[PDB]
Structure 1
């Protein structure tokens, strides 16, 4: 079970959520990012290094925004076959950690677009519209690491997709 400080990194943001990886680094899902604003968390956009790759968005602020936090490992994608936890917060405040077995990084057709991400199968009460941005995490030893942020899910809800940093690894026909 995630400690309270880990949950405290999960942060309401735009139409979804985001995650404080460190005092200065915040990750979220591209499509939830508020548009037509001049600031994020009170900081002018120009003072922020905003990196975006498909559905994966990262902010690095020039000042410490969460100095209470230690830096956490951000993996480029979740270990295939690993059971990760999606740290879902609901608007009510309810915490809903969901266990998901991670699959492959690939592109999924989502509402007309081919979206690069990583799929997983819900093991656990699933994800719902508004959950986008919630972090996918797992433990390595006594530490938690984050590997993706929630983006989408199948109609049944049994399959979820998170945005990741990793690109398209080498696959060959056999």
Structure 2
């Protein structure tokens, strides 16, 4: 009784932050995420945090933002899911200027190691499940909404998948930029 379709977490929507030519997410008080193609060239600080006191770590369209200080504007600590099983419905957070939030949805596929620029990277595909917002280099972007963060309900909370990397030739299929860490060395 009353289960399908429910209210979305507010703080979860505020986590997203349109930077440069894309959108990121607040991994934690002093932690953040962002894509590579989204990163612009002109700014030297984020939310009042000079790069001089920041750390960057690329990894297949996955940059690790480590701030020297914990801004903690309205966060606490989110969970990162390195991919997803077969049948995982993820949702992106597309915020606009006039508050036109565009909540997109995508169905996760299988986990495999793709090859980009002669580099093996681990990422989970994702078939579109909305209409046809995909253009070819993203699930649904127009004014520069690339790299958007993915979210999903996990137990009694919402875990983040990756970021809007790009779309496939099929159009209704994008790749969720996953992070590198545990799970690859573990056996189970």
Fold-level similarity (TM above 0.5): yes
More moved, 30-39 vs 44-53? 30-39
Pair 162,170 (structure 1): closer, same or farther in 2 beyond 3 Å: closer
**Is the partner of 2:11 in helix, strand or coil?**
helix
Q: Which runs of 5+ in 2 are unaligned?
A: 1-7, 131-138
Q: Is the 8 A contact 2:106 2:129 kept in 1?
A: yes
Q: Is the 8 A contact 1:13 1:32 kept in 2?
A: yes
More moved, 86-95 vs 57-66? 86-95
Structure 1 vs Structure 2 CA RMSD: 3.6
Q: Is the 8 A contact 1:83 1:100 kept in 2?
A: yes
* Offset at residue 57 of structure 1 (A): 1.1
* Offset at residue 169 of structure 1 (A): 8.4
Pair 157,114 (structure 1): closer, same or farther in 2 beyond 3 Å: farther
* Offset at residue 129 of structure 1 (A): 6.5
Pair 106,168 (structure 1): closer, same or farther in 2 beyond 3 Å: farther
Q: Is the 8 A contact 1:104 1:118 kept in 2?
A: yes
* Offset at residue 26 of structure 1 (A): 1.0
Q: Which runs of 5+ in 1 are unaligned?
A: none
Q: Distance in 1 between matches of 2:9 and 2:125?
A: 25
**Is the partner of 1:55 in helix, strand or coil?**
coil
Q: Distance in 1 between matches of 2:171 and 2:9?
A: 26
Pair 172,44 (structure 1): closer, same or farther in 2 beyond 3 Å: closer
